[PDB]
Amino acid sequence: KHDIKLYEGDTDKYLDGSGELYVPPSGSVIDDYVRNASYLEERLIQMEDATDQIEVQKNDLEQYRFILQSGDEFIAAAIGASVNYVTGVIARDKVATLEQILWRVLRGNLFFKTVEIEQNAFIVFSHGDLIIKRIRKIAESLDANLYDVDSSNEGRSQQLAKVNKNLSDLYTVLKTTSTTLESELYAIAKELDSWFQDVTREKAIFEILNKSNYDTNRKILIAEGWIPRDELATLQARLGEMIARLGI
Amino acid sequence: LTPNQVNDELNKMQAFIRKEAEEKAKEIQLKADQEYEIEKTNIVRNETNNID
Amino acid sequence: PTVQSLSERKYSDEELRQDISNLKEILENEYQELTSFDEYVAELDSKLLCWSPPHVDNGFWSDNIDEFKKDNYKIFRQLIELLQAKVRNGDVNAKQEKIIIQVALNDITHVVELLPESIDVLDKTGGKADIMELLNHSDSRVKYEALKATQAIIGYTFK
Amino acid sequence: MATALYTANDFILISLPQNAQPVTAPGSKTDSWFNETLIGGRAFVSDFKIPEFKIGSLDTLIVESEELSKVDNQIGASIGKIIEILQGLNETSTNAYRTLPINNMPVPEYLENFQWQTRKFKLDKSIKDLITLISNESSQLDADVRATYANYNSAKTNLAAAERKKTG
Amino acid sequence: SQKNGIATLLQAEKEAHEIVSKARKYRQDKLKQAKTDAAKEIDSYKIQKDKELKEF
Amino acid sequence: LSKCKSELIDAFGFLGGNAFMKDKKGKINKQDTSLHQYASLVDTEYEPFVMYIINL
């Protein structure tokens, strides 16, 4: 999510600068750390899904805002339903041609072809209100975004006034989400590293104690000893060539 | 094609729409004349039976 | 939450384990096993609202939608009315009033996401506008809940 | 073609408005152009104007074109099968069964009096049912010739088998 | 002439709908007429059946 | 047949469309993906004027 690449660097020791800091000199309460991460994570995954959902709606609607406006002008009958218009974006005027051929040859001469430049090409076919099913099969099979009204905000007259107000609700909703996302990225970026290091040591602690029976039949000597709090720092700094030295 | 060519076809479009509809509309009103007579004979035969 | 975490990290002595398990069962059992309709009506009426184990579940809402209807989802409508009321009267970011808003907003997302007819209710009552202000109103949980409250509404208006 | 005609010619059917004009050599009447200009005057032009059909709607028109196309390939298919069965039988001529004048009357000549033939097809009937009748007729004929040949091929196997039993 | 043409096309479609609706309006009227033109034949039979009674 | 069809395409094709008349001598047939199609089923190029060719 954060757009951050994998951090490993493999430290349990408190001697070093980064050691002291990303790994506490305090003890390890395994429950506490798990909890710290679980709750933030629940918010974050919910957040990302939302961001994506909101972003796709805003993007569709922003694109087709202008589409319906252009189509209304090509004169007040595209807020109504006296005739059928097919609004649509297509990326190539080339594909527009092939559709025009299919159209003329085989369904007669019944299109009004108008076009507007987008950043795509805005194509307009206009057809009867009884032969609408037949235009869709043509449009769909060559892939065009030719729907009768590309906006789903049809529900008052003018239709464009409803489109404008959902684009108004969308644009701010999106803003807030992004704001929530940044601060949270900032906030747990540092923590994510510090927790990663913590966990490595938890996996080790269990292993030292023996958490399954293979660990018992692996090292048969288990000894006990006392290292005071300060010296504890230098004890993990060295590691032997076979020794796993417990912190706290 | 050119706007002119597309306007020749436009003219053709409203020609089609109008012609199939006049053709439809003649059949539609011809069923309406068969229906007038037939309904009229049916009301009458029912009623004279009652009067009888 | 504290008990559930404990259950994974048990202590060597058996008796300790027994106490962790027995306590875990009563707390959890007790809240869910009360009727869903009862809990919802009881909180809204008294005006004191707080999240709880079955009060945040998707199921709670699913069962309770139909029941609401008496005058076009009259109970749900009273809730939207409560969220609206709190913000305007007595201001916002006063301890009491702030607890209710986050809860009220959690409840309204689930209901809306569930039934598309709810969209009319936000518009008629005038709750839809109140939510837009709530994005702007301080505290992370409040703007978080408002964003969720908005995204559920949007999805049915424009797909 | 040069063996798939022996008394036929090959045909192009075209329809134009009565307002159409040629731009190959302007100023000419469409009728005059076909005779004089089209491939060195060698063109034999015949009338093929067929009268009106009832047409119910704009939607239904579209559906008619669909039927005309498929059936026409299907009938073309059916002629392919019949001709294949005649060759199979060892019926080959220099003027038949690979050309075959329609009813023993040259092919360009048949088309010249084809001004909508009536065999149970009527010019005051509805268009849809006529399309179906023509296609039904051909299909039934197609099944008949196929079915009879199947029995012919099977019958030949019995004779062949039996000839070895009597001496072989 | 682009939006002048579309509006003619648009008008073309209304004229077609009106042509169709006119034929449907005819039938509707013809349904009321069938009752009207049947009411005149019936009441002339009614007073004849009374005439031959006034005789008896 | 070919030379005949070409003299017709050039003569009458203009009515169909100014860009839709190309020179062709012999039946052009396409069937590669949905970018090239020729048939009465589906097409993206065809005869600009109405023409069917009949061969026995």
Curated annotation (Swiss-Prot), chain A:
Subunit of the V0 complex of vacuolar(H+)-ATPase (V-ATPase), a multisubunit enzyme composed of a peripheral complex (V1) that hydrolyzes ATP and a membrane integral complex (V0) that translocates protons. V-ATPase is responsible for acidifying and maintaining the pH of intracellular compartments. Is present only in vacuolar V-ATPase complexes; enzymes containing this subunit have a 4-fold higher ratio of proton transport to ATP hydrolysis than complexes containing the Golgi/endosomal isoform and undergo reversible dissociation of V1 and V0 in response to glucose depletion. Glycosylated. Present with 55714 molecules/cell in log phase SD medium. The chain holds residues 78 to 362 of 840 of the full protein. It comes from the Eukaryota. This is V-type proton ATPase subunit a, vacuolar isoform. V-ATPase is a heteromultimeric enzyme composed of a peripheral catalytic V1 complex (components A to H) attached to an integral membrane V0 proton pore complex (components: a, c, c', c'', d, e, f and VOA1). Belongs to the V-ATPase 116 kDa subunit family. Residues 40-68 form a coiled coil. Residues 1-248 are cytoplasmic. It is found in: Vacuole membrane. Signal peptide: none annotated.
Swiss-Prot record, chain B:
Residues 8-38 form a coiled coil. Homodimer. V-ATPase is a heteromultimeric enzyme composed of a peripheral catalytic V1 complex (components A to H) attached to an integral membrane V0 proton pore complex (components: a, c, c', c'', d, e, f and VOA1). Interacts with VMA5; the interaction is direct. Interacts with VMA10; the interaction is direct. Interacts with RAV1 and RAV2 components of the RAVE complex, which are essential for the stability and assembly of V-ATPase. Belongs to the V-ATPase E subunit family. Present with 16134 molecules/cell in log phase SD medium. Keywords: Acetylation, Coiled coil, Hydrogen ion transport, Ion transport, Membrane, Transport, Vacuole. Subunit of the V1 complex of vacuolar(H+)-ATPase (V-ATPase), a multisubunit enzyme composed of a peripheral complex (V1) that hydrolyzes ATP and a membrane integral complex (V0) that translocates protons. V-ATPase is responsible for acidifying and maintaining the pH of intracellular compartments. It comes from Saccharomyces cerevisiae (strain ATCC 204508 / S288c) (Baker's yeast). Signal peptide: none annotated. Residues 12-31 are annotated as: Interaction with VMA10. One of its GO terms (cellular component) is vacuolar proton-transporting V-type ATPase, V1 domain. GO terms for biological process: endosomal lumen acidification; Golgi lumen acidification; proton transmembrane transport; vacuolar acidification. This is V-type proton ATPase subunit E. Residues 1-13 are annotated as: Interaction with VMA5. It is found in: Vacuole membrane.
Swiss-Prot record, chain C:
Transmembrane segments: none annotated. Disruption phenotype: Increases the ATPase activity of membrane-detached V-ATPase V1. Abolishes growth at pH 7.5 and in the presence of calcium chloride, abrogates growth at pH 5.0. It is found in: Vacuole membrane. V-ATPase is a heteromultimeric enzyme composed of a peripheral catalytic V1 complex (components A to H) attached to an integral membrane V0 proton pore complex (components: a, c, c', c'', d, e, f and VOA1). Interacts with YND1. Subunit of the V1 complex of vacuolar(H+)-ATPase (V-ATPase), a multisubunit enzyme composed of a peripheral complex (V1) that hydrolyzes ATP and a membrane integral complex (V0) that translocates protons. V-ATPase is responsible for acidifying and maintaining the pH of intracellular compartments. This subunit is essential for activity, but not assembly, of the enzyme complex. This subunit is also required for silencing the ATPase activity of V-ATPase when V1 is detached from V0. Belongs to the V-ATPase H subunit family. Present with 22500 molecules/cell in log phase SD medium. This is V-type proton ATPase subunit H. The chain holds residues 320 to 478 of 478 of the full protein.
From Swiss-Prot, chain F:
Signal peptide: none annotated. It comes from the Eukaryota. It is found in: Vacuole membrane. V-ATPase is a heteromultimeric enzyme composed of a peripheral catalytic V1 complex (components A to H) attached to an integral membrane V0 proton pore complex (components: a, c, c', c'', d, e, f and VOA1). Interacts directly with VMA4. Present with 21114 molecules/cell in log phase SD medium. Belongs to the V-ATPase C subunit family. Subunit of the V1 complex of vacuolar(H+)-ATPase (V-ATPase), a multisubunit enzyme composed of a peripheral complex (V1) that hydrolyzes ATP and a membrane integral complex (V0) that translocates protons. V-ATPase is responsible for acidifying and maintaining the pH of intracellular compartments. Subunit C is necessary for the assembly of the catalytic sector of the enzyme and is likely to have a specific function in its catalytic activity. Reversibly leaves the enzyme after glucose depletion, causing the catalytic subcomplex V1 to detach from the V0 section. This is V-type proton ATPase subunit C. The gene is VMA5. The chain holds residues 337 to 392 of 392 of the full protein.
